Design a protein around this ligand. Structure first.
Ligand SMILES: COc1ccc(C2=N[C@@H](c3ccc(Cl)cc3)[C@@H](c3ccc(Cl)cc3)N2C(=O)N2CCNC(=O)C2)c(OC(C)C)c1
Length: 87
């Protein structure tokens, strides 16, 4: 009974690029897959792994900043919610 969401096109493209196959997800699944996108594309700092640099990537278009820490929860949840609809 978790809320189901339907990502908008750019978010869906990111999710499918890391092997998600569906069109509707829970918020925890969206977060998991975005994390995997960062990990697979090596967008994090090797020393302080919470730090992401996304300026030269579509992820930067999603979050609207060139860099962020994964501790920026308000920004991360807000930008994900701007990029989906509830089902
Ligand atoms: C010490 O290094 C860490 C510690 C925590 C995270 C993290 N933290 C998790 C997280 C972060 C923010 C929210 Cl709002 C929810 C979950 C989740 C995540 C989910 C979405 C995004 Cl956009 C980024 C990361 N997320 C992860 O995706 N992790 C967990 C740890 N290792 C991983 O391989 C993947 C982390 O993420 C990297 C991808 C940058 C690195």
């Amino acid at each position: 009974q978790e809320t189901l969401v339907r990502p908008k096109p750019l978010l869906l493209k990111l999710l499918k690029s890391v092997g998600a196959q569906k069109d509707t997800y829970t918020m925890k699944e969206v977060l998991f897959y975005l994390g995997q996108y960062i990990m697979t594309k090596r967008l994090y700092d090797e020393k302080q792994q919470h730090i992401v640099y996304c300026s030269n990537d579509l992820l930067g278009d999603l979050f609207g900043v060139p860099s962020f820490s994964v501790k920026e929860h308000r920004k991360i949840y807000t930008m994900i919610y701007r990029n989906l609809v509830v089902v």
